[PDB]
Amino acid sequence: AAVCDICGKGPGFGKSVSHSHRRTSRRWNPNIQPVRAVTRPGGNKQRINACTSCIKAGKVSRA
Template sequence: MSDRCQLTGAGPGDGHSVSHSHVGTSRRGEPDVQRHRHVVPGLGRTAGVAAECPCVKRVDRNGIEAAGARIRACGERI
């Protein structure tokens, strides 16, 4: 099972690696999903978030409360 970003829902992409002779072979591009733990004052505990690297910056900027609300709106639990 591949990783998915809990904030954006970004998953793996597919495409072709093209060699010098222009032979295309299938490839799979995995997103760079990192798991981070954040302290959530509203819940009184820590919460783990699996997010892509650009989304980690978004969590730091907007706060874990807003990110948690967005994750819960998608039907996932944090």
């Protein structure tokens, strides 16, 4: 849910600054979506984890 199966996009690490400036560790996970793609026009469908950026790029083939 944090590593893209296409481009390997991974979560980012940072801090959650509060009003009193208390910095606490937190994570920025990628927008991973489970998509059943069609690797070849033959019709085989496989469930892969692709980020929404990959879907926008058309790199995944949900035919």
